[PDB]
Nucleic acid binder design. Structure first.
Ligand SMILES: [Ca+2]
Ligand SMILES: [Ca+2]
Length: 314
DNA sequence: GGTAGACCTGGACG
DNA sequence: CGTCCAGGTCTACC
């Protein structure tokens, strides 16, 4: 059929594949696990969302990642658009090599890794990542997903429509900085988070030097990046780490949330040493982050993604 | 300097 | 139905 979300079976000539074993990527363990909140399994095993300013549907077989794009006459994805997908999933990073290393230096990781292969980090846009996680504050993935769709629907560029779903690109800084945005977001149910969205958009455009400021952070060191980000309203240590890890190429960035705390205590019998508090606090969270870094190495943030994602399946 | 409490909400239970 | 919960952050105050 010419309409609705496609499936690999229904429109074969419209899909192109990318060599990618499931051991290197598990869409069902990455896409809905709290990295990006903009992917939906519209059809069993088929995930649709905006990628590189276009709508796509992705699905995998044992050795292939099948892709289709909705831009003109419908056609299979081109090699270049396909590279956009490989970039998004950072496929040049061999997951089996990381899993092996983490497994060698951490017996518990190896145990869990046996049943959760394919968890890697998406390489996201700084803007979407910054605002999606500002909304993650005291929030569950599903509610977060809801706020983000509404926020994009109301302020993002309109793309194409599949069935009764109209896709929207992520809002720009200018749109998020616009007048009465907060009030509109509040009506969209973002709660106090509405305030931070507006505030951080204005702060970036009117105080920090605009988009270029956020983007040039990719070249900065994790330490610098993380400090800069904590300036913005609504961006604390956790939100800042999520951003450094998922959007600024800071693989040693380790987000420390309630999940990681439970994991630390329950699976590593971890306790704060230099910290004053016994539970979550700005000092204990920092310490726990350094604990995971000393334990997993330069890509601790990625290792973190595996266990976090695995901890959601509980 | 290191906390306790305020700020929003739709599914979650008991 | 009423308290609890989820990828927190901010800040007046001890
Ligand atoms: Ca929480
Ligand atoms: Ca801040």
């Amino acid at each position: 059929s010419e309409f609705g979300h496609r499936t690999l079976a229904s429109t074969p000539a419209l899909w192109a594949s990318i060599p990618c074993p499931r051991s290197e990527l598990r869409l069902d363990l990455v896409l809905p696990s709290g990295q990006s909140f903009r992917w939906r399994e519209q059809s069993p095993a088929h995930w649709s969302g905006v990628l590189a300013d276009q709508v796509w549907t992705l699905t995998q077989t044992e050795e292939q990642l099948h892709c289709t794009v909705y831009r003109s006459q419908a056609s299979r994805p081109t090699p270049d658009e396909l590279e956009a997908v490989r970039k998004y999933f950072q496929l040049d990073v061999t997951l089996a090599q990381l899993y092996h290393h983490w497994g060698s230096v951490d017996s518990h990781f190896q145990e869990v890794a046996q049943k959760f292969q394919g968890v890697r980090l998406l390489r996201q846009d700084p803007i979407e990542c910054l605002f999606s996680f500002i909304c993650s504050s005291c929030n569950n993935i599903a509610r977060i997903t809801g706020m983000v769709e509404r926020l994009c629907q109301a302020f993002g560029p309109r793309l194409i429509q599949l069935d009764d779903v109209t896709y929207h690109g992520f809002p720009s800084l200018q749109a998020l900085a616009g007048p009465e945005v907060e009030a509109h977001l509040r009506k969209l149910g973002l709660g106090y988070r509405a305030r931070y969205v507006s505030a951080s958009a204005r702060a970036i455009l009117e105080e920090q030097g605009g988009l270029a400021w956020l983007q040039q952070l990719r070249e900065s060191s994790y330490e610098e990046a993380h400090k800069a980000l904590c300036i913005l309203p609504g961006v604390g240590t956790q939100v800042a780490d999520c951003i450094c890890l998922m959007a600024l190429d800071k693989p040693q960035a380790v987000p420390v949330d309630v999940h990681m705390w439970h994991i630390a205590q329950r699976d590593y019998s971890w306790h704060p040493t230099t910290s004053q508090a016994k539970g979550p606090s700005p000092q204990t969270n920092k310490e726990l982050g350094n604990f995971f870094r000393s334990l997993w190495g330069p890509y601790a943030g990625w290792a973190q993604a595996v266990l976090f994602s695995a901890d959601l399946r509980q």
